[PDB]
Amino acid sequence: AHADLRINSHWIIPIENTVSNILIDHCLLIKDGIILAIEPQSSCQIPATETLDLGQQVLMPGWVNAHGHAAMSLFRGLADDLPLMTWLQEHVWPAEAQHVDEHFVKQGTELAIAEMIQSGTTTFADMYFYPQQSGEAALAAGIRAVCFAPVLDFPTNYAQNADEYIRKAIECNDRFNNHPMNEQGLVQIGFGPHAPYTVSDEPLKEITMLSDQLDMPVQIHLHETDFEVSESLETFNKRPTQRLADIGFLNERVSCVHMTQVDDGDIKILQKTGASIIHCPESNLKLASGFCPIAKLSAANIPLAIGTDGAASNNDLDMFSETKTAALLAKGVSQDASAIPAIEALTMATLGGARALGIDDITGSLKPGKAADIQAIDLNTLSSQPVFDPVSHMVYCTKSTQVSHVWVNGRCLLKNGELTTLNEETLINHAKAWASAIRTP
């Protein structure tokens, strides 16, 4: 048959229309990992090799988790309820210096990926050590990934200095351009300078040039805390946004994480440079970083996305919960019950992330021609019934465990709630082994 797979579902939320936000009794037709068409089930005349009848479920794009540190799944809830400073100095940094190597990153990324697939995520962004390990795990699992190879001014086990961080990013990009398993381009490598206060101007400019030459996305923290903004004003006499804008670092391919400290000048700079904002509400709350004013940013037409951050400051990788927090918090922050309606929250969590990571041409919404990165959510459960508008249900009363199926590039990674490329029992054993090693070395 022309189509590999036909999926029938009562509801489809395409995110991009091709003027209601939802389609009733349509089907998706997929071929070679690509969406061929979305059409009414009754009218459809495209035969399919295989057909799946989902019934009372919602099909929508898989989530794009636009900021994370996948391998830190192995530090899940390592040290909760402590100030950023104690958390970092007495727990996270020693644990990183002692435990994080290629094996840690491999097993941690596998664990994260399995959690993410089970909660409907089809693309993750990763900013962490040993990105080749992370990228390789993504390849074996079949999940789409953007690994923002870290760049820092300071030495770690992974690299001694900015130039070495950059070298390894270039090497990793080259390795994935040429990897036998990566012909489909599921894994992209980018540059992940941590933050303006940990990376100097020179490496940042190198990143800009290299990012352009090698077609790589860039991610950086921006205005995460009042402290970082004050520090920048003391040291550079500029807000970080201004510093980055003045050296030409900010542009469309850059995503700026957090942005809890926002003034009108920041917004103008963001509008000018075309950069995206990645919202991480739960992590911002948990660490007391502040309140990203996504309502205000949205009204200013700033591109917005959503990330969970890492499992040591969340502590899960559940985009259903993160998107719900984003939609609820925004109404409180803006004092406006109509701010960030459900369709907008879903859009941030899918197409917004795709745009932020530079991959919206291929994924992030259900449009003919885009990749078949799809999640199916089963609504026939007590906590989801009755349903009046499935779009708002997705955001306000859906558990991630309702995800029944997941496809990436048209490949089934989750079938009736069960992982198809990862072994849950094995991953859990490895997690427990690492916990013991971390707990009592």
Binder of a copy of itself out of 10, 279, 355, 393 (CB under 8 A): 393
By CB under 8 A, name the one of 80, 174, 215, 361 that touches a copy of itself. Answer: 80
Which partner, Ca ion, a copy of itself, none, binds residue 309 by CB below 5 to 8 Å per kind? Ca ion
Task: Give the bridge partners for 220, in sequence order.
Answer: 256
Strands (E), 92-249: 121-126, 144-151, 187-193, 218-222
Q: Please name every residue paired with 29 in a beta bridge, in sequence order, or none if there are none.
A: 6, 37
x/- map, 40-79, a copy of itself, by CB under 8 A: ----------------------------------x-xxxx
In sequence order, what are the beta bridge partners of 147? Answer: 126, 189
Helices (H) and strands (E) in the chain, counts: 16, 17
Q: Count CB atoms within 10 A of the CB of residue 50.
A: 11
- Is residue 389 close enough to count as binding a copy of itself by CB under 8 A? yes
162 — phi, psi (to 5°)?
-50, -50
Cα R_g (the chain), whole angstroms: 21
Report in angstroms how near the CB of residue 286 gets to Ca ion at its nearest: 9
How many beta carbons lie within 10 A of that of residue 414, not counting itself?
25
Alpha-carbon torsion angle 116, 119, 120, 125, nearest 10: -30
Bridge partners, residue 63, by sequence: 121
Reading the block at residue 400, the tokens are 């991630």
Contact string (CB under 8 A) for a copy of itself, positions 268-287, x = contact? --------------x-xxxx
Residue linked to tokens 């996504």: 294
Pick what 434 binds: a copy of itself, Ca ion, none; C-beta below 5 to 8 Å, kind-dependent.
Answer: a copy of itself
Q: How far is the CB of 49 from a copy of itself (least distance, A)?
A: 32
| Contact positions with a copy of itself (CB under 8 A) in 236-275 | none
Site for a copy of itself in 308-327 (CB under 8 A): 311, 314-318, 321, 325
- Asked if 380 is part of the footprint of a copy of itself (rule: CB under 8 A), the reply reads yes
Q: Which is nearer to Ca ion, 328 or 412 (CB)?
A: 328
Question: What whole-number distance in Å separates Cα of residue 375 and Cα of residue 36?
Answer: 17
Compare residues 119 and 188 and give the one whose CB is closer to a copy of itself: 119
Contact partners, residue 32, CB within 8 Å, separation at least 6: 4, 410
3-state secondary structure of 164: helix
Restricting to residues 309-348, name those near Ca ion by CB under 5 A.
Answer: 309, 314, 316, 321
What are the tokens at 194?
């941590």
Cα 322 to Cα 330: distance, rounded to the nearest angstrom: 12
The yes or no reply on residue 84 touching a copy of itself (CB under 8 A) is yes
Min. distance of Cβ 94 from a copy of itself in angstroms? 14
Q: Contact between 388 and a copy of itself (CB under 8 A)?
A: yes
Shortest approach of a copy of itself to residue 377 CB, angstroms? 14
Cβ of residue 97: shortest distance to Ca ion, in angstroms?
A: 18
Q: What are the residues binding Ca ion (CB under 5 A)? A: 282, 309, 314, 316, 321
Q: What are the residues binding a copy of itself (CB under 8 A)? A: 74, 76-84, 87, 111, 114-115, 118-119, 282, 284-288, 290-291, 311, 314-318, 321, 325, 328-329, 331-332, 334-338, 341-342, 380-389, 392-393, 395-397, 399-401, 424, 427-428, 431-432, 434-435, 438-439
